[PDB]
Design a protein around this motif. Structure first.
Motif, PDB file in Angstrom:
ATOM      1  N   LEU A 110      -6.436   4.288   0.386  1.00 43.02           N
ATOM      2  CA  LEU A 110      -5.376   4.165  -0.578  1.00 43.02           C
ATOM      3  C   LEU A 110      -3.701   4.723  -1.196  1.00 43.02           C
ATOM      4  CD1 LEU A 110      -7.483   8.359  -0.771  1.00 43.02           C
ATOM      5  CD2 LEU A 110      -7.983   5.705  -2.294  1.00 43.02           C
ATOM      6  N   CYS A 111      -3.285   4.467   0.119  1.00 41.93           N
ATOM      7  CA  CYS A 111      -1.544   4.247  -0.355  1.00 41.93           C
ATOM      8  C   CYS A 111      -0.996   2.831  -0.289  1.00 41.93           C
ATOM      9  CB  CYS A 111      -1.121   5.247   0.866  1.00 41.93           C
ATOM     10  SG  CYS A 111      -1.132   6.436   0.634  1.00 41.93           S
ATOM     11  N   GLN A 112      -1.777   1.754   0.735  1.00 35.62           N
ATOM     12  CA  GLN A 112      -1.531   0.317   0.550  1.00 35.62           C
ATOM     13  C   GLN A 112      -1.666  -0.381  -0.394  1.00 35.62           C
ATOM     14  OE1 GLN A 112      -1.962   0.692   4.870  1.00 35.62           O
ATOM     15  NE2 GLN A 112      -0.560   2.134   4.894  1.00 35.62           N
ATOM     16  N   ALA A 113      -3.481   0.141  -0.295  1.00 39.79           N
ATOM     17  CA  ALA A 113      -4.522  -0.728  -1.318  1.00 39.79           C
ATOM     18  C   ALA A 113      -4.233  -0.722  -2.458  1.00 39.79           C
ATOM     19  CB  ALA A 113      -5.264  -1.751  -0.926  1.00 39.79           C
ATOM     20  N   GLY A 159      -1.511   1.939  -3.903  1.00 39.28           N
ATOM     21  CA  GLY A 159      -0.583   2.080  -4.431  1.00 39.28           C
ATOM     22  C   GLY A 159      -0.580   4.098  -5.099  1.00 39.28           C
ATOM     23  N   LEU A 160      -1.386   4.599  -4.274  1.00 41.16           N
ATOM     24  CA  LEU A 160      -1.239   5.971  -4.646  1.00 41.16           C
ATOM     25  C   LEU A 160      -0.508   6.722  -2.882  1.00 41.16           C
ATOM     26  CD1 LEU A 160      -4.927   7.773  -4.625  1.00 41.16           C
ATOM     27  CD2 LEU A 160      -3.482   6.431  -6.530  1.00 41.16           C
ATOM     28  N   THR A 161       0.473   8.161  -3.933  1.00 43.62           N
ATOM     29  CA  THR A 161       1.122   8.430  -2.773  1.00 43.62           C
ATOM     30  C   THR A 161       0.663   9.637  -1.163  1.00 43.62           C
ATOM     31  OG1 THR A 161       2.102  10.275  -3.726  1.00 43.62           O
ATOM     32  CG2 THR A 161       3.372   8.470  -4.034  1.00 43.62           C
ATOM     33  N   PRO A 162       0.782   9.394  -0.229  1.00 44.64           N
ATOM     34  CA  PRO A 162      -0.317  10.698   0.022  1.00 44.64           C
ATOM     35  C   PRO A 162       0.170  11.758  -0.677  1.00 44.64           C
ATOM     36  CG  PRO A 162       2.007   9.480   1.337  1.00 44.64           C
ATOM     37  CD  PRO A 162       2.085   9.136  -0.051  1.00 44.64           C
ATOM     38  N   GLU A 163       0.915  12.347  -1.187  1.00 48.21           N
ATOM     39  CA  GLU A 163       0.395  14.072  -2.533  1.00 48.21           C
ATOM     40  C   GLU A 163      -0.257  13.362  -3.486  1.00 48.21           C
ATOM     41  OE1 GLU A 163       4.164  12.202  -1.503  1.00 48.21           O
ATOM     42  OE2 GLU A 163       3.760  13.813  -0.187  1.00 48.21           O
ATOM     43  N   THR A 187     -11.863  12.092   5.627  1.00 46.93           N
ATOM     44  CA  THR A 187     -12.253  11.425   3.931  1.00 46.93           C
ATOM     45  C   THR A 187     -10.408  11.083   4.691  1.00 46.93           C
ATOM     46  OG1 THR A 187     -14.557  11.709   3.550  1.00 46.93           O
ATOM     47  CG2 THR A 187     -12.441   9.797   2.615  1.00 46.93           C
ATOM     48  N   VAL A 188      -9.322  11.727   4.687  1.00 46.82           N
ATOM     49  CA  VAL A 188      -8.286  11.498   4.445  1.00 46.82           C
ATOM     50  C   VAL A 188      -8.056  11.234   5.288  1.00 46.82           C
ATOM     51  CG1 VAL A 188      -5.887  13.077   4.659  1.00 46.82           C
ATOM     52  CG2 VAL A 188      -7.674  13.733   2.615  1.00 46.82           C
TER      53      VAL A 188
END
Length: 493
Positions: free
Chosen positions: A155-158, A160-164, A147-148
């Motif tokens: 999740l990061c682009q649309a 705004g979450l960081t990979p962390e 799922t990652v």
DNA sequence: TGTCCCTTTATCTCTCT
DNA sequence: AGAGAGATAAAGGGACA
């Protein structure tokens, strides 16, 4: 006849033979494997006993038990002997990391997915092997890893979450469910309710994360009009394992506890804001009058006990043990409350009841000292470690009982004590620290990694810390432990 | 059943100033 | 130091082959 009899007999025959070489398992280890891995896991351990313990793999019996004691344990055992060399040689993982991945239900699936997906997750997606291991090291780790791989971009682009943050969400049991729910609910929670992504990540980053997020969406309106809770209080309740259960129970019990016992909503939120908050709240409603009766404990003391993880256990144990600890062991009720008011209070109370006479009479400690050791999270562990290590620390390493008690009397006391026992000689003999300096470093929370960071700098000196003398490194280590040392390391670059 | 996945509770350890 | 944050294990239930 009962149909489980044949399987039970099979279990007990094989279990008997495992007590012998090369594993030599005790009753506890055998029950534990039987309870979760079942009969097939016990048989698998036996069939694999020689292949696992010695060359090449060289797994300890405790590591073998860790792998075997889960659903599909038989599968995980077969997979580890197959993939441990592959993952250590070809991906640079340590045996300990492979064992960590293997030691969960469906460990086979996690191991095989790590073998399959680590390269793409690290190359195409920018994750480290450490992060991939953390994601993999939970039940459903395969689902979380897949799922990652699929959702890290959106999740990061649309969103705004960081990979962390994505990794933090993924690194819990049910991680797939939390990631998918965060994708759907992040704009809803943020835009409709003014939550920050940081708050949403915090709710999502626990086991059952999906449930807490959906429950926050459902109940935030009701909790913040009717009950006068702030969004921040709601977030705090939800930002814990079983968050959904705590939130629903807060809705149910806030007015009951406030009206019938004069608790503030602040006190109710604090009780709710731990793993098992549901259990703690219901226990407070039940037990507060029982505890506070006939001039017993005060409401305020009951709230303190309840306001930690496992509050229900601590409350019930106080009810059981207050009289016997006060009458038979000489403790004040105030000292019982102190011991009880930390995560795992039940364990610490029971360990005090068991070890107070022994620590006092055999080791020459005061009750006050036993209470101070007990009165931290993991108090049970610190108490047992003091019982174990006081003679060696005092007689072989030259520490006073006072210094041992000081090391013991913080969260992680057990770890600090074991690390001191371990590293005192190289720190003093090999590098010229004084015992008092070693004791000072170890006498804080995070004492263990602070000591390890110091030993690391003296054993494999990083140039970035070279401008610091031993005495300066000691001052830093006492001031802020491993993080201060690590921070300084970065500041230099 | 055996295996996989998800959720809840309890316990332990470290960080953050 | 005490509030915050994070890891790990036990144990139960859904799901399915």
């Amino acid at each position: 006849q009962w149909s489980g009899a044949r399987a039970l007999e099979a279990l007990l025959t094989v279990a008997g033979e495992l007590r012998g070489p090369p594993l030599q398992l005790d009753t506890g280890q055998l029950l534990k494997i039987a309870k979760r891995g079942g009969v097939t896991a016990v048989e698998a351990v036996h069939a694999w006993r020689n292949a696992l313990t010695g060359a090449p793999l060289n797994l300890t019996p405790e590591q073998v038990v860790a792998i075997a004691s889960h659903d599909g344990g038989k599968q995980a055992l077969e997979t580890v002997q197959r993939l441990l060399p592959v993952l250590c040689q070809a991906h640079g993982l340590t045996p300990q990391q492979v064992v960590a991945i293997a030691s969960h239900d469906g460990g086979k699936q996690a191991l095989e997915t790590v073998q399959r997906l680590l390269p793409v997750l690290c190359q195409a997606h920018g994750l480290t092997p450490e992060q991939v291991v953390a994601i993999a090291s939970h039940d459903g780790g395969k689902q979380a890893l897949e799922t990652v791989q699929a959702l890290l971009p959106v999740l990061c682009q649309a969103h705004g979450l960081t990979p962390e943050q994505v990794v933090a969400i993924a690194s819990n049991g049910g991680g797939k469910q939390a990631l998918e729910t965060v994708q759907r609910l992040l704009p809803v929670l943020c835009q409709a309710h003014g939550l920050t992504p940081q708050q949403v990540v915090a709710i999502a980053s626990n086991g059952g994360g999906k449930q807490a997020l959906e429950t926050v969406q459902r109940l935030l309106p009701v909790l913040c009009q009717a009950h006068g809770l702030t969004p921040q209080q709601v977030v705090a309740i939800a930002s814990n394992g079983g968050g959904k259960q705590a939130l629903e129970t807060v809705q149910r019990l806030l007015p009951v506890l406030c009206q019938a016992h004069g608790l503030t909503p602040q006190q109710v939120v604090a009780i709710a804001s731990n793993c098992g908050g549901k259990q703690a709240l219901e226990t407070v409603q039940r037990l507060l009058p029982v505890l506070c009766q006939a001039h017993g404990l005060t409401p305020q003391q009951v709230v303190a006990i309840a306001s930690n993880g496992g509050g229900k256990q601590a409350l019930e144990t106080v009810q059981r043990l207050l009289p016997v600890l006060c009458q038979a062991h000489g403790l004040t009720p105030q000292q019982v409350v102190a011991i009880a008011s930390h995560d795992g209070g039940k364990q610490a109370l029971e360990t005090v009841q068991r070890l107070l006479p022994v620590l006092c009479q055999a080791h020459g400690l005061t009750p006050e000292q036993v209470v101070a050791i007990a009165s931290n999270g993991g108090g049970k562990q610190a108490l047992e470690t003091v019982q174990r290590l006081l003679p060696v620390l005092c007689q072989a390493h030259g520490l006073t009982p006072e210094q041992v008690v000081a090391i013991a009397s913080h969260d992680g006391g057990k770890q600090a004590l074991e690390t001191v026992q371990r590293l005192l000689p190289v720190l003093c003999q090999a590098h010229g620290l004084t015992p008092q300096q070693v004791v000072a470093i170890a006498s804080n929370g995070g004492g263990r990694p602070a000591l390890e960071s110091i030993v690391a700098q003296l054993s494999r000196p990083d140039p970035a810390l070279a401008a610091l003398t031993n005495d300066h490194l000691v001052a830093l280590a006492c001031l802020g432990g491993r993080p201060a040392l690590d921070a300084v390391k970065k500041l230099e670059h």
